[PDB]
């Protein structure tokens, strides 16, 4: 019964939509789904030099890449929420089913 | 003879073993998060890998 829908994405709005879609949309089937938990945002920073050569003032680019992770938890067998997850998915959001 | 003179000098580490996955150039390499990309090529392909300038 311990199934976690693990929603990880880079964009915030596609992740809020898809997570709310399995909470707001998963209202009128009387499911026992527990509220949304947000893991701390993993901010991947790579600081390179702008210049191809070594010439001029030392200017650096600071490329960031914020990636987010969210948990959906419920006490029911597999196909009762594979009905829910299979419909209206996003390329941007990666969703992994942990049945155990 | 010369088939003991291709890569018989053992290649298990150093700057000669690894290079960028676009050019095969041995300098300014980024191994961070398994890019294996030269700093010029990364700054070119920053936008289209997913990296953003905000700060």
């Amino acid at each position: 019964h311990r199934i976690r829908i693990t929603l990880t994405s880079r964009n915030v709005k596609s992740l809020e939509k898809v997570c709310a879609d399995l909470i707001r949309g998963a209202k009128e089937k009387n499911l026992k789904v527990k509220g949304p938990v947000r893991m701390p945002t993993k901010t991947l920073r790579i600081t390179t030099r702008k210049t191809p050569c070594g010439e001029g003032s030392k200017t650096w680019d600071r490329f960031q890449m914020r990636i987010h992770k969210r948990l959906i938890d419920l006490h029911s067998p597999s196909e009762i929420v594979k009905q829910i997850t299979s419909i209206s998915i996003e390329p941007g959001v990666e969703v992994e089913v942990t049945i155990a | 003879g010369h088939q003991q003179l291709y890569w018989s000098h053992p290649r298990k580490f150093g700057q000669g073993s690894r290079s960028c996955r676009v050019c095969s150039n041995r300098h300014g390499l980024i191994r961070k998060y398994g890019l294996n990309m030269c700093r010029q090529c990364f700054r070119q392909y920053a936008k289209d890998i997913g990296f953003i300038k905000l700060d």
């Binding site: - | 398994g34 289209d48 890998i49």
Partner: peptide, 19 residues
């Protein structure tokens, strides 16, 4: 996956694949 590539590398791996 057996080597089980982490979340900070999965986004990178799809990114470099797209490029």
């Amino acid at each position: 996956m057996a080597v089980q590539i982490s979340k900070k590398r999965k986004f990178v791996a799809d990114g470099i694949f797209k490029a």
